[PDB]
Design an enzyme around this catalytic site. Sequence first.
Site: not given
Lengths: 400, 400
Positions: B78, B165, B193, B226
């Site tokens: 990404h 992600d 998120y 993350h």
Amino acid sequence: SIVVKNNIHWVGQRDWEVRDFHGTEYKTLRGSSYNSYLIREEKNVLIDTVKHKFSREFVQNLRNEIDLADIDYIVINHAEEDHAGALTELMAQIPDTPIYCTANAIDSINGHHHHPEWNFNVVKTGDTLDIGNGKQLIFVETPMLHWPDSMMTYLTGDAVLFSNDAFGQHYCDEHLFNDEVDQTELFEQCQRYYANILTPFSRLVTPKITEILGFNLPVDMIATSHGVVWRDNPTQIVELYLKWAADYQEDRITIFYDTMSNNTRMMADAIAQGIAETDPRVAVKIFNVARSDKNEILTNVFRSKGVLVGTSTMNNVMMPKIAGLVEEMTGLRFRNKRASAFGSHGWSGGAVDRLSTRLQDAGFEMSLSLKAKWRPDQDALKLCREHGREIARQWALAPL
Amino acid sequence: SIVVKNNIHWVGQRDWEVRDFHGTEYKTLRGSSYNSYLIREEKNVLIDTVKHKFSREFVQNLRNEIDLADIDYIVINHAEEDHAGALTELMAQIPDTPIYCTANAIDSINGHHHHPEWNFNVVKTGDTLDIGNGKQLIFVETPMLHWPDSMMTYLTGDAVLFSNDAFGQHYCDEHLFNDEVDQTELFEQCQRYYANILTPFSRLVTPKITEILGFNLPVDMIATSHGVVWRDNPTQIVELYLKWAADYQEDRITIFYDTMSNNTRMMADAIAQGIAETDPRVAVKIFNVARSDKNEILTNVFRSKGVLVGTSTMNNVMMPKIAGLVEEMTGLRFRNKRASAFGSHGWSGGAVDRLSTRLQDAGFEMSLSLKAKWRPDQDALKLCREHGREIARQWALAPL
Ligand SMILES: Cc1cc2nc3c(=O)[nH]c(=O)nc-3n(C[C@H](O)[C@H](O)[C@H](O)COP(=O)(O)O)c2cc1C
Ligand SMILES: Cc1cc2nc3c(=O)[nH]c(=O)nc-3n(C[C@H](O)[C@H](O)[C@H](O)COP(=O)(O)O)c2cc1C
Ligand SMILES: [Fe+3]
Ligand SMILES: [Fe+3]
Ligand SMILES: [Fe+3]
Ligand SMILES: [Fe+3]
Ligand SMILES: [O]
Ligand SMILES: [O]
């Protein structure tokens, strides 16, 4: 209290701490003041009150000035909470005291206070109220300047125009008069107020001021409901309002945007460069809306001949702060201004066209949009710089 | 660096200070982390990098782990700046190193870095990359989860899914694994998120996860880009994504508004009372958008079966923060949710109908609006309370 002139006493409240008006829609970076006036002739007249927050202080201070029972008339020029906010507390002490206001003011006062049993006296333009000693009040309806209930009150002899919101500004100072404060700070706050509040009613400003001036009434002072009392060349603010109302614009371009990864910011800076190197007469300002004072942006837009608004595409739409600001501008109805949309996108985009359309709905005469994909390289920045060049040429107030 | 498992090393960066992502569109109240991974088998593989802000630290730390020249392959899942941000600095040292990524990733990497001379290797779902010792990488394309360039990388044997992600969260902690951190804080950040980022792509989430699960690949760990590495019951976050993707809603109603003089606030509180005294099963949350965390509002909207949005009329339009929030919701495409507009006005109004229409454009199934003039008195508050009663009955998940 402070003597304004002769038997006119300022009995208002200074607010050094206030930073937000109308929610957070108006930022008061220099605080504000709420001007209330007590006129003591044969009749005693109270003109406006103050914000509800200070109703306790207001009533007590008023007591130190006069027995509340000796107040004959109450005048309410405007029933917004920052001026009519202490009205319930006051009327609890002197419930039989007549309130002079516009027909629309009955609706707005009752709408906030829910005490329709109060003794209202509807006034219209030309109506008078004798207060003795050869002096009288003259009422002037100013509907939609800026509320339906708005009016002004003129005191003959002393020649004082109590204009409420009009000609006022949010500027807190221990000194009362315009010649006693910082002139640059005063002007900035005056223009900030008009741009953010009065802009949409500019078509009404000129005729009403022309009407008021046609009365041939002398004006020694203009005592507003916010900030200073105009006593030295008082009609200077009236003249400013006439200039500001005439679809005001300087040779100035405002650029503002939001950005998620700074690509649109890079575009904005390049556009600005193109403008500056094409037309040196133009003043340029750039704002990131996420990091800037919204009211400062709007004051600049007010002063500008045109604007460029930037957004990237976020979930097929524009970034929310831009949509919000565009919504607000649609309500302010800026006139005779031009606009161009710009911004970056990742794949399918669509936010720039979306913004261009809404700017048009907001009343701006639209020039072509500027688009770029991801981060602009040197070639893309050239195109942005050229866009600024094309805008500068299109929006030139004069040749070259 | 930290050992994730066997020869998998975490070489990322913790960000305790970060508070804003995507401009200020995503508030990280618990900071974040940027997970990069170094796999050392027969071949040495770097998976993702970190935010550009920490490119200096990243390259130096990576040096302390391995000679940069001994890095055989670079994988970019990404190309958003927080993961591919240090790529230019790294590639300056080892320019011949092959980069494995999706076709769309060439566009996005070049779009940010402008180094198309880099050695890109397009991968598609099912493609493999042998790294020795009986281990290989398996690539899985995940377009629009959440970017066109997005993909995941699976490591056989060790059975680690590098999901970038997906399944991640912004939660900074010195501990690497999910079983080592606060579970409530972890869940909150995970749901925050998804609600704010992944909601619009929920129709894509289920089929892709179903596709990935169909590969019958073992999963010992999920190493995202993350926050924590999922090692204890790792597929729990996968199961949460399946629930969240299915037009998720609880028995919950979110109320939010902006207000200039608190009249709409009074309406909101009364509405909430009506709901609570009608359906005790419903969880109610109220937010003033001018004074609240926008992302918290959106997380609640995500969790809610319906919403009520309030605005007063400001210059014939709605208040800008409501228009902005409504714009953003139009991009998030919440599904199977109901909505009702409400708010106060001074004279002609129009903002409540304006808002009701835009909520409908945003995809909400609209119930009737609730309107009031100025400040609601006891009778008006009754009507607001009754509106809450009618909403609670209409939106009841079950009888009574
Ligand atoms: C959350 C998010 C949503 C996005 N949605 C879109 C989109 O719907 N269409 C598109 O073309 N690009 C989309 N993009 C890509 C951005 O528009 C692209 O990165 C752009 O160059 C960023 O501009 P900026 O740095 O000025 O914010 C999205 C990016 C992010 C982070
Ligand atoms: C700056 C401003 C602009 C307004 N514009 C309108 C308007 O265009 N139409 C209207 O009916 N009322 C208008 N009003 C009146 C408000 O809508 C009214 O005071 C309302 O009851 C306030 O609701 P709130 O306290 O929740 O903000 C305006 C008020 C202000 C302060
Ligand atoms: Fe006002
Ligand atoms: Fe005012
Ligand atoms: Fe991302
Ligand atoms: Fe990320
Ligand atoms: O006001
Ligand atoms: O990201």
